[PDB]
């Protein structure tokens, strides 16, 4: 959240919120309604976003093939479940104003996780990216915000 | 460190659910009180000094507390006391702008046993912070003054 | 930090005695299990990753523990959990090669109150380390697998 | 002990024993039998080793003379008792593979000890050295190991 | 106190009092009687010292005028009370041999105090200075010691 | 950290009073014992080594305490023990010169639970410090020897 982030940045220097940071928070609260709108639009079409998955596989068939991390319908399914997770994280981030909830919930130490699991990270990046192509298709340029959210996800993954 | 928004989020994360109409409602409310919070934080930020002044002279000065045998009697204990009130006010402004008191439980409260073990009285401290509540209130308003009220009171319940 | 040999020594130092036939016997035994310990430590060192994998998927994955409301549900808590199992395994290899579990009581155990105070469950941890016992065992053998067994179990008794 | 030493050296870097350190430990365990043999040979002839003391005194008569730290038969005796201590430490070290037990038991802060007591440290060094001449006489070149053990003692003392 | 100060300075280096520091303490104890004499002379004439206040006001009428920190007879009185405080601190210091009691009791964080209160610090410095003109008038050159005590006060204030 | 003089001062500060005839009297007394304290501190400073020697050989050497199974048996525990006695003596000289035992309660005492938790026995320690009392006494005199006596005893009461 932009609010918690400026709070921690200020407290780190034992100071009050500067008028600039306050103005930023004002722009945020004034963007609240459009923000929630985007959030609920994404939530509504989440199953479509994650399913259309298909683009990832079509672009990275290795992950679902023998030897790949998502070989089989059960592992494929689990991989779809992760994409759902990250999309939800994207909706949180949208509502919050920054990437705090995404980082806290599913980027601090992801590389460790998937390294243990044997999941190719670039594959995840491609899945969430495709999720941003579909998602961007669901939104009419509003698309920016969610855009940089996804982008921060597939960037932060690797 | 969470707040109204992040509190709603985390409320919608441990259950593994997307934000439902309720989350959107609470978020709506905070978005409705945001401008108020921002302004109040600006005003307090501008007048922190005068507020701690009016609080100290309000509940502390010209009593035993400040005289020999007193807990803020020497100049070093005076600076420590007004420093504590400055902290309390700044984190009250924090929590106020945020919308949730966890930051207090996380970065100022986790203090009662310390004050007990070093002799710092809690009564005059409660009365002091409350004085900050009345000063801040009368200087900002009834809405912003009650919103600070909930957090100041929170600190009172934490010390007591 | 002692081991079989140094444990025998210290057993022969606080009494102020030179090493008697008994000390020579115990030392003999350890010298007889040495090559085994060395090899097992090599094999575990080579396959630590795959072992922690087989342990996690063995006792942890696809349950509540990993889902929302879970203790290893977020990615940061997942990395912390697999990091704990990595530590446990590495000190199990240590103690194994050494021949005495004191290193565990000295550099990993002195943790139960911490897990309790931070919410880390002990049950799934016991089941996890035990899973490491079965994986390591089946991958190294019955002798080396039981010798790791005694130390893994030791950690279980330390946490529980 | 070589075993505890490589353990602590490795753990200091949060790593497993390297194949080289493991091989070293292998050479140690394979030297176990000869090692114990030397240990029990020294233990058997310990009284001889410490008594033949005499060489020290003959080389450092000042310590036993008036004004010296070991003036009198009681102080002489106590000084013989210290030599016994250090020889025992040497047998521990022999069995262990390094100087850990000797350091831990009777070199960490010895200079402080003897400084309080008023004992000349070089005198101790000479006593344990003589103990290595006799000891070396009891062993047929096997003599190396115990050799560097004693040497590490009289070196570490000062 | 000179005694506590040399103690802490020595302990800071884990050492005994040096013969020089000891000699200093000797000069102090030998000055004890004259010291106490000065202390009781000041204490006796304290009300005179603080009252003759008047010199401060005459030199800094702004502090007692409208807008000034000591406007009114009640605030004037309180300001006289502070001068009494600092004079007492001066007597403590005199008895002690250094500025420890003055620092500990009423200089650590004074600027913070008076900044909150809105008191001009230079005004305090002038009050205690005048207190040193009167005080110096009460003592016949003995005047040195108390002199540097006051001076350390009005210096340390700002 | 206070002493006779600063103790009198603080006794005259928390009440907000100038020094009265009583303060002047106590200060007088300390000023009367000052030269004694200074000299004694010089003599102890000159002979600290020999004093710790005579204390150790006095109560410690040639018993279990120093033999295997003993708390000062190894050379590292011997250096730690004589280091403790050196500290105790130096702070005894401090408090002695000062005239008040608070420095002990502030920089050496706040130790019993530590010794208990690490096995350091208190009995042989009390006997050791007392030995320092008798040695220091016989080497400085009856007056300076009793003035050290009060502080050595103070430490004994702190450990016990
Ligand atoms: C899909 C695009 C890629 C892929 C994924 C894959 N994931 C897993 C298993 C797990 N993934 C997680 C992920 C998360 N946990 C979290 O808390 C968060 C943040 C909210 C994330 C992203 C977890 C915990 C598991 C394991 C247990 C469980 O899910 O409940 C697998 C399973 C592999 C296996 O052998 O078990 C796969 C296959 N696979 C690909 O190839 C794609 C690149
Ligand atoms: C002999 C070669 C030299 C010498 C020695 C000497 N030693 C002492 C007294 C003590 N020595 C020790 C030594 C040890 N304690 C340990 O734990 C270890 C490691 C295992 C060692 C080496 C101790 C504790 C004492 C004092 C009490 C006791 O022994 O029980 C003395 C006594 C001196 C005296 O006045 O008491 C002497 C004379 N003296 C020489 O001149 C030689 C160079
Ligand atoms: C007088 C020369 C100047 C001045 C002074 C002034 N002081 C105050 C109020 C207080 N001053 C203190 C001071 C001390 N407390 C200590 O413990 C010590 C060390 C021993 C000192 C010096 C304190 C505690 C107070 C407030 C409460 C109380 O005194 O009990 C005031 C009051 C201002 C007001 O509005 O209340 C004034 C006016 N004023 C000047 O202009 C001079 C330069
Ligand atoms: C935000 C996080 C945070 C808070 C709030 C905090 C409080 C705090 N107050 C302290 C002391 C103190 N606090 C006071 C406070 C008071 N005296 C009075 O008479 C008044 C009634 C009252 C204040 C309203 C005083 C006098 C001391 C000094 C006690 C001493 O050490 O001498 C100390 C001991 C350290 C020191 O100041 O020397 C802490 C740590 N610390 C923190 O990290
Ligand atoms: C070798 C010496 C040593 C050990 C062993 C050790 C353990 C240890 N585990 C911790 C936390 C943790 N430990 C776990 C562990 C688990 N979660 C699960 O669901 C699993 C069942 C289980 C592991 C098998 C988790 C999730 C946390 C993080 C709790 C939190 O801070 O959020 C923490 C708190 C610090 C942190 O990680 O943030 C320590 C200090 N520390 C040490 O110094
Ligand atoms: C001045 C402030 C101060 C004091 C006094 C102090 C004492 C103190 N003594 C200690 C240990 C010890 N203290 C002794 C003392 C004794 N053994 C005996 O047999 C004697 C009877 C007795 C001394 C007369 C010993 C053997 C240890 C070491 C225990 C161990 O760690 O192995 C330790 C643990 C740290 C260490 O030395 O390794 C402290 C911290 N620490 C301080 O900061
Ligand atoms: Cl922060
Ligand atoms: Cl960021
Ligand atoms: Cl929903
Ligand atoms: Cl303080
Ligand atoms: Cl602080
Ligand atoms: Cl034997
Ligand atoms: Cl963490
Ligand atoms: Cl850690
Ligand atoms: Cl280590
Ligand atoms: Cl070494
Ligand atoms: Cl200090
Ligand atoms: Cl100074
Ligand atoms: Cl009086
Ligand atoms: Cl130690
Ligand atoms: Cl220490
Ligand atoms: Na600060
Ligand atoms: Na700024
Ligand atoms: Na589709
Ligand atoms: Na598939
Ligand atoms: Na990759
Ligand atoms: Na949270
Ligand atoms: Na879920
Ligand atoms: Na619902
Ligand atoms: Na809700
Ligand atoms: Na709900
Ligand atoms: Na608003
Ligand atoms: Na404003
Ligand atoms: Na009043
Ligand atoms: Na609110
Ligand atoms: Na504390
Ligand atoms: Na209470
Ligand atoms: Na030991
Ligand atoms: Na013995
Ligand atoms: Na036997
Ligand atoms: Na045995
Ligand atoms: Na035996
Ligand atoms: Na073997
Ligand atoms: Na291998
Ligand atoms: Na399952
Ligand atoms: Na074994
Ligand atoms: Na902890
Ligand atoms: Na339990
Ligand atoms: Na690490
Ligand atoms: Na290597
Ligand atoms: Na002989
Ligand atoms: Na002799
Ligand atoms: Na020497
Ligand atoms: Na030291
Ligand atoms: Na000097
Ligand atoms: Na006058
Ligand atoms: Na006036
Ligand atoms: Na000024
Ligand atoms: Na005090
Ligand atoms: Na007063
Ligand atoms: Na009186
Ligand atoms: Na008195
Ligand atoms: Na009185
Ligand atoms: Na005297
Ligand atoms: Na002298
Ligand atoms: Na005896
Ligand atoms: Na006295
Ligand atoms: Na401790
Ligand atoms: Na007891």
Author numbering:
A (entry chain A), D (entry chain A), E (entry chain A): 2 to 53, 55 to 143, 145 to 161
B (entry chain B), C (entry chain B), F (entry chain B): 1 to 110, 112 to 161
Excerpt from the paper describing this PDB structure:
Components of phycobilisomes in Gracilaria chilensis are Phycobiliproteins (PBPs): Phycoerythrin (PE), and Phycocyanin (PC) in the rods, Allophycocyanin (APC) is found in the core, and linker proteins (L) present along the whole system. PBPs are chromophorylated proteins that share a general architecture. They are organized as heterodimers (αβ), which assembly themselves into trimers or hexamers. The subunits of PBPs are mono or multi chromophorylated with linear tetrapyrrols covalently bound to cysteine residues.
The pure protein was characterized by its spectroscopic properties of absorption (λAmax = 651nm) and emission (λEmax = 660nm) and the relationship A651/A280 as purity index. The purified APC was shown to contain only α and β subunits by mass spectrometry experiments. The result showed that Allophycocyanin from Gracilaria chilensis was purified in an oligomeric state (αβ)3. The final crystallization conditions were 2mg/mL protein concentration, 300mM NaCl, 20% v/v PEG 6000, and 100mM MES pH7. Crystals were diffracted at Soleil Synchrotron up to 2.3 Å resolution. The trimer for APC was obtained by crystallographic symmetry (P321). The biological unit is a trimer of heterodimers as it was determined by size exclusion chromatography. Indeed, α and β subunits contained one phycocyanobilin bound to cysteine 81 and are stabilized by Asn71, Arg83 and Asp84 in α subunit, and by methyl-Asn71 (Asm71) and Asp84 in β subunit.
